[PDB]
Ligand binder design. Sequence first.
Ligand SMILES: CCCCCCCCCCCCCCCCCC(=O)OC[C@H](COP(=O)([O-])OC[C@H](O)COP(=O)([O-])OC[C@H](COC(=O)CCCCCCCCCCCCCCCCC)OC(=O)CCCCCCCCCCCCCCCCC)OC(=O)CCCCCCCCCCCCCCCCC
Lengths: 57, 63
Amino acid sequence: GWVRPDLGELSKVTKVKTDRPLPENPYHSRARPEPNPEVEGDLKPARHGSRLFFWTM
Amino acid sequence: DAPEKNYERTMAILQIESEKAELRLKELEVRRLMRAKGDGPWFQYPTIDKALIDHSPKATPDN
Ligand SMILES: CCCCCCCCCCCCCCCCCC(=O)OC[C@H](COP(=O)([O-])OC[C@H](O)COP(=O)([O-])OC[C@H](COC(=O)CCCCCCCCCCCCCCCCC)OC(=O)CCCCCCCCCCCCCCCCC)OC(=O)CCCCCCCCCCCCCCCCC
């Protein structure tokens, strides 16, 4: 009573009902380094201009 | 000019230039620390963007 699969069927992506748990770390990866702090807040102008030796703006 | 005017103008000039000098010293110290530790917004030399990684299931499982 077995029926041969039609063309296109054995290449279907199927779904599997399992009882084993999902691997929370399949790569055995460690903790990632914490990122650099972002930029935030309002942008005030430069204090006393460019401060390049004598340029007052 | 009045001596009051030159005197208080000199105090204004000295405050502005002392602030600029202290800010340049802080600028040197900030640049030294950010080159040394690499934790600030400056000297952030680029690494690989991890948005380029294909996280799809590949052809072989051991990866
Ligand atoms: C109501 C709405 C409208 C409001 C209007 C308000 C304004 C009303 C008046 C309208 C006109 C305004 C003009 C600009 C504002 C005043 C700027 C000024 O005098 O700064 C003083 C500036 C600093 O003096 P200060 O006492 O600290 O500040 C007074 C003000 O607070 C200065 O203010 P500051 O603190 O904001 O200045 C910022 C900063 C202040 O400066 C600094 O922080 C210091 C560093 C400045 C540069 C130094 C470079 C040194 C090495 C290069 C040398 C270059 C060659 C020298 C000259 C060769 C011959 C041309 O300036 C700069 O960084 C700009 C660079 C210098 C250019 C100055 C403006 C020139 C305008 C006309 C251009 C024509 C040619 C001029 C000569 C070209 C060479 C400069 O003086 C100098 O640096 C000495 C150099 C000569 C200055 C130019 C004088 C302008 C008038 C020229 C008329 C004659 C032209 C003759 C024919 C052509 C030449 C043969």
